[PDB]
Amino acid sequence: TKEDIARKEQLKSLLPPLDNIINLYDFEYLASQTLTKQAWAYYSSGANDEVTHRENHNAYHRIFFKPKILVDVRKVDISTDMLGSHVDVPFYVSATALCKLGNPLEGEKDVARGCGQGVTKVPQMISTLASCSPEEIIEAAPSDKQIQWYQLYVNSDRKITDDLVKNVEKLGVKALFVTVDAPSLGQREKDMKLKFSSKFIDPSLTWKDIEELKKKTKLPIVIKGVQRTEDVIKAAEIGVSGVVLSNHGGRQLDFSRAPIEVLAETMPILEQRNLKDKLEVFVDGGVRRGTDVLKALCLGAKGVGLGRPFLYANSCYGRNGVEKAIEILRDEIEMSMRLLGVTSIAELKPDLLDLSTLKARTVGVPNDVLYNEVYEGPTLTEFEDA
Amino acid sequence: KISPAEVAKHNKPDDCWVVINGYVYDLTRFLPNHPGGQDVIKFNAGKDVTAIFEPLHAPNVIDKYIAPEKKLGPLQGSMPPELVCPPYAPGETKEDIARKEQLKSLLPPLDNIINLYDFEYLASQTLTKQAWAYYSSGANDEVTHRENHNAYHRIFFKPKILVDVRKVDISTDMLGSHVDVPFYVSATALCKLGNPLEGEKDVARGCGQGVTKVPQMISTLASCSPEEIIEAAPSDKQIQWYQLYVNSDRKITDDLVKNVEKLGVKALFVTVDAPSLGQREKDMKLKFSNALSKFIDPSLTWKDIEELKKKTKLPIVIKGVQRTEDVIKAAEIGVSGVVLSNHGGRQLDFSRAPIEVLAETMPILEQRNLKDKLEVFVDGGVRRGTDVLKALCLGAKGVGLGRPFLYANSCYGRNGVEKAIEILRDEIEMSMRLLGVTSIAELKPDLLDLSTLKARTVGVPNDVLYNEVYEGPTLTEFEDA
Amino acid sequence: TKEDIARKEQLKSLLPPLDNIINLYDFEYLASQTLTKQAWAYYSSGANDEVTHRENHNAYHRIFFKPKILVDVRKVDISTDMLGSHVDVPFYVSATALCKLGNPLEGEKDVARGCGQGVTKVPQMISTLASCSPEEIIEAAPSDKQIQWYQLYVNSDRKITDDLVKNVEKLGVKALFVTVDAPSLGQREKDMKLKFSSKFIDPSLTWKDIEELKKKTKLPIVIKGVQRTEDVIKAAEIGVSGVVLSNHGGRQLDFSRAPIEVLAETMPILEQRNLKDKLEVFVDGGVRRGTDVLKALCLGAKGVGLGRPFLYANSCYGRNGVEKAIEILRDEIEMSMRLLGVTSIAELKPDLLDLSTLKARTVGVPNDVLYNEVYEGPTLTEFEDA
Amino acid sequence: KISPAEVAKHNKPDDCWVVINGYVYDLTRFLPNHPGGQDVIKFNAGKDVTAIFEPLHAPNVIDKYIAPEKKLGPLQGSMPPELVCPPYAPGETKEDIARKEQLKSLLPPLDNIINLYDFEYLASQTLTKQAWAYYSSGANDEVTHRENHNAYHRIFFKPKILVDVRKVDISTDMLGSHVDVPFYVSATALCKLGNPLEGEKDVARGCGQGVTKVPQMISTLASCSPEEIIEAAPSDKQIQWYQLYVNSDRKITDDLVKNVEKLGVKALFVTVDAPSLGQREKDMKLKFSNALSKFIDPSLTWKDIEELKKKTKLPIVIKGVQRTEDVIKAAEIGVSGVVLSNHGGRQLDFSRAPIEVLAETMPILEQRNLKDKLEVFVDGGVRRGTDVLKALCLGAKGVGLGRPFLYANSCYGRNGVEKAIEILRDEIEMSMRLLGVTSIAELKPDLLDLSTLKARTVGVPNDVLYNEVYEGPTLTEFEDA
Ligand code: HEM
Ligand code: HEM
Ligand SMILES: [C]C1=C([C])[C]=C2C(=[C]1)N([C][C]([O])[C]([O])[C]([O])[C]OP([O])([O])=O)C1=NC(=O)[N]C(=O)C1=N2[S](=O)([O-])[O-]
Numbered sequence A, C: 001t002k003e004d005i006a007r008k009e010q011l012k013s014l015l016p017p018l019d020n021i022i023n024l025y026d027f028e029y030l031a032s033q034t035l036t037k038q039a040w041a042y043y044s045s046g047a048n049d050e051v052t053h054r055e056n057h058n059a060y061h062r063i064f065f066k067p068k069i070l071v072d073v074r075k076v077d078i079s080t081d082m083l084g085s086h087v088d089v090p091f092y093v094s095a096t097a098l099c100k101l102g103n104p105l106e107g108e109k110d111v112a113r114g115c116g117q118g119v120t121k122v123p124q125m126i127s128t129l130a131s132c133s134p135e136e137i138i139e140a141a142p143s144d145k146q147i148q149w150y151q152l153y154v155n156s157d158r159k160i161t162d163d164l165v166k167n168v169e170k171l172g173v174k175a176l177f178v179t180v181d182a183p184s185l186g187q188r189e190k191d192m193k194l195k196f197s198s199k200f201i202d203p204s205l206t207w208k209d210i211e212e213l214k215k216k217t218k219l220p221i222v223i224k225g226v227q228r229t230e231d232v233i234k235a236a237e238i239g240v241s242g243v244v245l246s247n248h249g250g251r252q253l254d255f256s257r258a259p260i261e262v263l264a265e266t267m268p269i270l271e272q273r274n275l276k277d278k279l280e281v282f283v284d285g286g287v288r289r290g291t292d293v294l295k296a297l298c299l300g301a302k303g304v305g306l307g308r309p310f311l312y313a314n315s316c317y318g319r320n321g322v323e324k325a326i327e328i329l330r331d332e333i334e335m336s337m338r339l340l341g342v343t344s345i346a347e348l349k350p351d352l353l354d355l356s357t358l359k360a361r362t363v364g365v366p367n368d369v370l371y372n373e374v375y376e377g378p379t380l381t382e383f384e385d386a
Numbered sequence B, D: 001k002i003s004p005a006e007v008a009k010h011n012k013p014d015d016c017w018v019v020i021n022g023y024v025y026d027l028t029r030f031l032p033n034h035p036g037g038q039d040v041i042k043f044n045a046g047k048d049v050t051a052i053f054e055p056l057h058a059p060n061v062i063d064k065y066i067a068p069e070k071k072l073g074p075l076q077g078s079m080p081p082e083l084v085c086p087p088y089a090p091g092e093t094k095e096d097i098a099r100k101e102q103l104k105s106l107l108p109p110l111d112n113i114i115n116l117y118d119f120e121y122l123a124s125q126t127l128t129k130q131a132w133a134y135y136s137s138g139a140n141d142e143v144t145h146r147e148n149h150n151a152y153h154r155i156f157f158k159p160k161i162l163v164d165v166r167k168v169d170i171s172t173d174m175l176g177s178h179v180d181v182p183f184y185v186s187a188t189a190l191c192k193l194g195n196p197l198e199g200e201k202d203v204a205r206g207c208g209q210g211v212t213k214v215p216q217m218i219s220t221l222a223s224c225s226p227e228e229i230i231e232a233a234p235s236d237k238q239i240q241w242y243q244l245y246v247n248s249d250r251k252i253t254d255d256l257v258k259n260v261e262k263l264g265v266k267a268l269f270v271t272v273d274a275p276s277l278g279q280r281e282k283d284m285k286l287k288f289s290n291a292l293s294k295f296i297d298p299s300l301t302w303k304d305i306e307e308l309k310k311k312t313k314l315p316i317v318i319k320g321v322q323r324t325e326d327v328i329k330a331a332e333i334g335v336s337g338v339v340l341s342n343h344g345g346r347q348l349d350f351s352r353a354p355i356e357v358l359a360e361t362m363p364i365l366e367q368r369n370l371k372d373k374l375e376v377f378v379d380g381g382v383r384r385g386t387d388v389l390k391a392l393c394l395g396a397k398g399v400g401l402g403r404p405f406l407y408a409n410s411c412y413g414r415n416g417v418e419k420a421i422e423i424l425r426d427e428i429e430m431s432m433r434l435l436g437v438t439s440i441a442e443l444k445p446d447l448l449d450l451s452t453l454k455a456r457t458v459g460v461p462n463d464v465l466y467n468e469v470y471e472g473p474t475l476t477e478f479e480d481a
């Protein structure tokens, strides 16, 4: 109801200067105060109780580092290559449907500008349901070396997909991410709630359709949305290039595991089934700090993705916001490796980690209301009255 | 003919004379065995209690429980005016109207309810204090009632991708019939507290009127008679199940089984987990400023259930089993099923959550080959479609809900019970696709991550001095705000 | 400061009628509002951070029951015998120094009246630093069969102790509890704090002094204050009768284990070293409900003790308070056995218990301030405005 | 002679000219290597900065760090009035006086402080915002800083009874000397933020004036010179230890070791866990509206420590080891000790708590026989006497505290540092009796319950809808109140 004015006093001239944004949560606190209710509902939502959405972040907290001291770390190099090309930093913007709800004027173009306008050029997955055409987004994209991938929601009308694959290969996208964790649109009750005052995606998809989609294209194929060791090993038996261990930001099945627990489980199997070199394994979901990024790289992930932080940077400070988020994260990784005693993404191995309490995901017995309610704790000292 | 004078006189505990609907009853022998505590009858002895009485009981109870020669006689004209008891609402102020504006249509239109918690919220705001305490309470500290639900959250899923999940089919077979859904309505006592006009006649209706029909379990302590509730059923194809408390006068029980069998209920669920009434302190508290009885016999034994099979042709399900050895025993006397339950945490506190006993029991049932010969149901704390799926993956034939159907029926009558069925039917169908399975038959434990099932912790007390002085990081302030 | 008047409007005629006290916590909420600050400080205190004081209660919550259904439980008998005599119920009032701070007019006499004035007669441990003489307390004691024990703080001046042992044996006390967990008076900073506006106990005590104290008396001897399996087995090698597994209500060493964890550990060793029949093992600390009592009895304890609940019942409703607390607890035990499917304290064995998470005493990693601070949960439905 | 005009001119990042105490300095080469960030120097370039400068630095720093020919010359008379910088208190309003009434004597009399948390509380109320942020902050999310202390609580005790604990003796030997206590004061940088007049000269004093004297570790970044701090020591028998950051200009480091060795410090603690400055976001935040440098060389290697042994006769302790393999390496190059530390959680977040690495390390040190040849110290989050005892039982020779001595010295100067020593000396003595041991030598791991050491959990998110609607039990209301 006419909040738009209050909200406008918020973003107009009260957002702080980008030089004061310390971490990816600041982009998120500011976007929750100014985005429109339906932008906010749609970007932040999770499926149902959002325990997977949050467990995704929190599972990073079950893993602690075992650093090395007295290692020369004057120079640290954080570039890696993902899926053939060499990339500046080991993370990427992952794909967000409808980026124009938050940044109406420039949509997923400003993200494209942000991933290539600064020193660091980060990859950008363009969403099949992006609110700006592939055409435009790739054209906004400031800088040759900055790479871009299409993620695909195969349609029931396979005609539309085949044309679309062909048209983006024409446009030079550098790989195909087929999202398979969404045969139906998980329930996101925050949306639902405010929406009170699908043909588009084919629920029939199958590994055979991935096999045929292989033959219809030359780009590399990454299945986005694996959540089991068994389908990582399958995506390897039908020969795709990649697999993103992901549960769609916890917007699809609640009580799906966090990707980092599934990565730590799958990688030893890959190594024992000898498949490890044959598969790029990416991981996204709830990654908010450089040490999160680094924990996933140490276990074997090739690149970790981020959806919501970029998206809220982009919605509050447009393409410049996305540049600042790209470097905030770039400095976190870089400072932490220096502190970890490694100098290059390939040095990042598992023995930099204490994985002994990775499975200490607990649900504690219900608090004792009454005992807690009569108990009074000690008190600090006081200060003279006056 | 009995004079008011003579009547009123006997207002004392070892001589309870009371009047209900212009009739005097000698309730002396009766009150220590009144299911809803003897306090009510004791206190209101020597009065005309009909307003307490008439709106909370099944129409058949005076005839069914009191010896014929205790129905004393007609009261002459009427009581003294301050001897007719007004409707029982302990602790309720004149609130009755503020909670009636609260419910009168400020209750949101029934197509805006997104989940089963919405009905809890709505009922906690509009229901009568006696009925909220009665419906929402657990035994003592309620740690088993909360634990019943949180134990679900110690289980994660292990989904399949790129499976054609175009058509998914959630229907199944429970106890001989084929049901549309894998959940049912468990027996709750006294539904008229929250739905004074229809009570159970409305859950008979929401369960059967729609394109999905859910099994209904009727309670031995239901505020409507089993005839009234079956007669309310709108569909000829919906299943009703009768739940039994066996009385110390076993002929009373024996007539009751014969009766519900003729009305055509389809199974007999014999509750065995309340030999004594658990202590529900929110209720208790509500009378102080507002445990045995012969009614539930505290002597049932495995031999009784052995004798009941012989008296009946309905399948018998033992409802209230809390450990594997009793699951295995129930199997050995050839009963058809067992409902793993702790009665919604209203009886022993620190009884375990049924999802955890089921994860324990079903592998022992498989290894003993008794697995295919006993259907195992589970209830307690099931609020979402993925709780139901966690139980079906571990082996339970069917999942019971007692409390969400009581708040739904309480705020919205039968269309609440039908809406509540759609919420949950959609949530299950919806996560069967995202799990990559298309039929209940495909739910297997290899779809669950069971490795932290047992990670039920009690953490050490924390340090109020360390945390009293710690300040966390802060977010950026706006230039304004 | 003149709170005494407000406080007096509290206890005078605003305490609820004893018939409305539902559980042992109600006695505690009411005593915290009316006791004098120094009574309250001294009764509720723990050593230092009070984590042992609370862990004592909470460790009961790590243990869940495995009940039996379809057991005739029309009749349940909860009496047991402790230390030779046969006792009504399996719990006892444990010893509280200075009971007159809360009940100034009748001190530990009203407790003595309370343990024998009703149907149930419960034991009463009389404290060496009780604020009423043994003489009086035993004389207040209404009823022959009601039993009473002295607990002893041996003095440095052993003369005073020897006379005192002899004088209480004269007075018919039924056993000696020597408290050994207190060679110094643990720091109870709530006291300390309000006290801003020892020869009495011998820190030299040793198992030899217990050996000699055996020869100077005929009463049975219980060492109160064992906290290790090793000294349970020692108290058995020098032949005393009992041992109370206790850490003095967590007023002595913080980070002492809860008695119930130590009981569950010690009892199998006793059984394997064959000593089990030779030792009564009691257990007190943080027992507040009948199911607590029952969990300790199932593992082998002979009787569980309670300090603070009796003490606050006694300070708010004097001897009648203590009667009501004795029956509140008596009905809890009795209802729960009925629900457990057992009919007699000897039926209470370990297999009535799920001890699988007894050691799930966890300290979780620090909450993530910022993530939690930007996250907003789902919302219940609302109700029309008006 | 230099004219104000010429000076002020160069107020730009690649030409920093600044005036401090009537003297112009060319600080251009210098500011990217200024330990307290280059931002301060950058911003105040072209001004007379003496009020920022004079009150926060050791008296010897311009002479020790700047090339002699950069000390430009005398400034002629004085700056423009709005070019003399006022004392740095970022984000502090005129608050300086409300916090000065706060501290002026409404600070409670020093014999009422019951524990080390009291000083935290008092300093958080009276200290300057720059100094509270600086002293109290951790890296990033601060989970290692809090975790440093809570890890203690995952260890319980296993006490002895009926042991004669009449006389208990807490004294011990650390690094060759015999100390009265098993704790010491770890090096904190900039003590003048919280104690502007004496800084470190007062912890030299509280540590030595009393009947108990505690070892003091002096920082390479101390706001007083190592001479001033040793000269302040009141007792001839107290131990001072020097902590080193080695600089990229190794001659600067080499002169510094030679110097502190002549002043008679007793050990060299070489911090190795901050090659780069951890990101302490409370500080950061305080300048926005208020990481390498050559100063700490990011190239030290095990060979450097190998070369330092040859240059020195002090024992060398490596301070900042976070894993067993580096404990074992430090042992293999024959250094005397290792301080298991993560620098008070100010450097890498998700580094482990030192009490847990020590429980891991000491059994591997015993089995390799290196156990007796390396003294292992531990710091981080030690606030009570039973934390110290948990570390001594597991093997640590001595426990370090950096932050409680900084709040104590900040609110109460040297008598705070002496009081803080008594609080902790009493708490240790006191629990050695209740453990039943009378000497540090008797503390062994068979006195600890170590079975839940590793029970460091992160629980699943909980269900805000289930808990939003649950109401717990309530206590009895008074008839009144
Ligand atoms: C005439 C014989 C009676 C029979 C056979 C009878 C039977 C029952 C039964 C089967 C219940 C269900 C218990 C539950 O689950 O809560 C009940 C509850 C109750 N009855 Fe009766 N009743 C009788 C007389 C009375 C009388 C005379 C009163 C009037 C004071 C009364 C008041 C109640 C109340 C208040 C409850 C609900 C328990 C509560 O307070 O939550 N009943 N009765
Ligand atoms: C003349 C050469 C200088 C030397 C050798 C020097 C040295 C140092 C050292 C060793 C520290 C300790 C760092 C810490 O742990 O926080 C420090 C801090 C600091 N210095 Fe200097 N400094 C110099 C010039 C300046 C100047 C000209 C300013 C004036 C703006 C200044 C302001 C500060 C401040 C503000 C800090 C504290 C860091 C904070 O803000 O928390 N320094 N300096
Ligand atoms: C957030 C989001 C949105 C807004 C949208 C979207 C998304 C999300 N997604 C997801 C992804 O990309 C990822 O995975 C992320 O997010 C991760 O996590 P974080 O935590 O970081 O956030 C998606 N996906 C796909 O594939 N596609 C698209 O488009 C998307 N979107 S939806 O579908 O959901 O709408």
Ligand SMILES: [C]C1=C([C])[C]=C2C(=[C]1)N([C][C]([O])[C]([O])[C]([O])[C]OP([O])([O])=O)C1=NC(=O)[N]C(=O)C1=N2[S](=O)([O-])[O-]
Binding pocket: B134, B135, B136, B148, B186, B187, B188, B189, B190, B219, B220, B221, B222, B243, B271, B319, B341, B342, B343, B344, B345, B346, B379, B380, B381, B382, B400, B401, B402, B403, B404, B406
């Ligand atoms: C809640 C409830 C009520 C109200 C009542 C009742 C009950 C309950 N129950 C129980 C059952 O049904 C179940 O189990 C349920 O509840 C579970 O939980 P949830 O959580 O889901 O809810 C019962 N039972 C029988 O059988 N009967 C009857 O009636 C009942 N009720 S009482 O007895 O308690 O009254």
Ligand SMILES: [C]C1=C([C])[C]=C2C(=[C]1)N([C][C]([O])[C]([O])[C]([O])[C]OP([O])([O])=O)C1=NC(=O)[N]C(=O)C1=N2[S](=O)([O-])[O-]
Binding pocket: C042, C043, C044, C056, C094, C095, C096, C097, C098, C127, C128, C129, C130, C151, C179, C224, C246, C247, C248, C249, C250, C251, C284, C285, C286, C287, C305, C306, C307, C308, C309, C311
């Ligand atoms: C509480 C208390 C008080 C007040 C006092 C006292 C006590 C206590 N104690 C202790 C005992 O008795 C026990 O152990 C109890 O308490 C248990 O716990 P609960 O939780 O229940 O509370 C004691 N002890 C002895 O022995 N003695 C005496 O006297 C005592 N007291 S003091 O010493 O501590 O004062």
Ligand SMILES: [C]C1=C([C])[C]=C2C(=[C]1)N([C][C]([O])[C]([O])[C]([O])[C]OP([O])([O])=O)C1=NC(=O)[N]C(=O)C1=N2[S](=O)([O-])[O-]
Binding pocket: D134, D135, D136, D148, D186, D187, D188, D189, D190, D219, D220, D221, D222, D243, D271, D319, D341, D342, D343, D344, D345, D346, D379, D380, D381, D382, D400, D401, D402, D403, D404, D406
């Ligand atoms: C807190 C602190 C400050 C203020 C400063 C500083 C520090 C700290 N550090 C560290 C040490 O000393 C230790 O480790 C402690 O702190 C532990 O924790 P607590 O929790 O106990 O407190 C340091 N270190 C060295 O070495 N140096 C120096 O100077 C220092 N400081 S900084 O660097 O960071 O500035």
